[model samples]
Target: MNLKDSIGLRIKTERERQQMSREVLCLDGAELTVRQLIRIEKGESLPSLDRLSYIAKRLGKSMTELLDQDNITIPDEYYEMKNRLIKFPTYRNPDRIKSKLTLIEEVYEKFFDILPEEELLTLDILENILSFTSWEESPKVEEIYEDLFEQVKRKRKFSTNDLLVIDYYFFHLYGRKQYDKKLFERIIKRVLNQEIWTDDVYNIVLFNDLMAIAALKIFHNSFSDFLTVVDKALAVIEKSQLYSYKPSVFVLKAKYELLHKENKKEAAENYDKAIVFASVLEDSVLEESIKAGKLADGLG
Candidate 1:
């Protein structure tokens, strides 16, 4: 079935699972008005992003859980490329750039079966692709910032937070990548004013922020500034209510605190939290790796 039909089926299924009628579910936690809910269920309208998220939450599922139909399948060649790409030493070898580009093409082909062709070619795709490749390459402190900036510029849109995120990364791309007390304060200001970022964007921003701080703490013999940035990033994560992204962020945060700041106590706590959050999702090789890391960190 199509997207609309899939949405209807999922909503119908969830409502039944809850032993609640459409009217009751509509009244329980819908962000949309009752009339709107009726229209959405009838496949006559689409839910706003907020409304859709609300519905998914009420049904005890994620937005992806509700919308994911798993109808599209990747080609064998794509998987082949993925396997090869994973084996390549991404960070130490700039020559692997060609393989990275190939991986992007494979991903585009895979995602194109689901996303619109136009969107597949958009800057968002490029940004996300760059992020994956860059992270795979070296996870160097500066590479994260540079890739993020390149991705945003490729998209041709910028908000104040976007610039702040860039600044956050810039401070740690090298020895000079420090916690600019002034810049940190400015980021808080912009966040208050714009308030335009979403949970997903916040996830990316805060992850980059934490990584930069971690790198600085290790290489530059910095702790005071790292502490402030870590606190600021944690606050944003809490405020955004982007709980799902927490597991990955927690893993990164723990690494920073333990290895750089040498705060084994908080690191252990974060590791436990990461495992608990990750356990709610499906079992995958990546998920297994995360769980292994958590256990290695002394999580019960």
Candidate 2:
């Protein structure tokens, strides 16, 4: 945010927080008009020092508090993701995005010497699987893939969360070929049996795992299988009141209907329901992505 916009947000939020209005703010015996206050908040105008100071004082803040970048804060829980913008990726082409990723790989390598070799190696292999888009083309990735699988096959015990993650990437990253479906069921039963994990983390992991399964089913051209997985996921989410997850799940179902089954009516209802949840989540971008994909069809 620019300086003007930062100041505007600080002033606007502070004034509203204090139950004060722009119409009531006075500077030099003159009240700031609604027009000027809004313009200032929109970052189109920078108020004079006198007006700035007067507004700050009226809102029970100092001029520095209104102007300081660090002083202004937004609600953290406004979005349900419960995450922050610790890293950003903006790439126009294949080579562009790897800039940071290469550095990250080196950082992981540094830990290889210090941490337990097997433990760190398994994690690094898993990370490569999760993070690398071109891992299939990379010979090093092929090497790590073999090593990681040996380790996974050797492991005897797993945390509920760890099993959840492994189960997810097992299908997504490795395809879980020749793996028993009963083993997959065993892991999920563990997840369902445990109450030690936070509801948010558990539900989010559960939701993604099911989505990955559904995606795999679509790849196999089995619409019935996808629906079965989705229904089970919805039951778990609804049973636990994991409302934050329903938006993504709804969007996924819409895609399955539109892009796999060629059912526009079902797709439309799914998208509409997704929009309702997205709006409540205050994520118009999610809503837009749903709309963007809705016009597509499985005409093949």
Give per-model CA RMSD: 16.9, 21.8
Model 2 per-residue lDDT tens digits across residues 1-300 = 665566777677877787766667643333345655765676654565655766777777887877775332223331121121112222322233344455445544543222222233334433443444444455543443343343344344543234444543554434433556565444444433434234544455555567666665555454655666677678767766766567777877877878687788888888788878877776667667666655554221
The total of clashing pairs for model 2 equals: 0
lDDT of 1 at 224: 51
> Per-residue lDDT of 59-141 in model 1, one digit per residue for the tens?
88888787775333335764455334433332433443465666666676664444421222222323343353343333333
Candidate 2 ranges beyond 4 A from true positions: 1-114, 117-131, 137-144, 147-203, 235-244, 256-263, 298-300
Evaluate residue 168 in candidate 2 and report its C-alpha lDDT on the 0 to 100 scale: 32
Q: How well does each candidate superpose onto the true structure, as a TM-score?
A: 0.37, 0.46
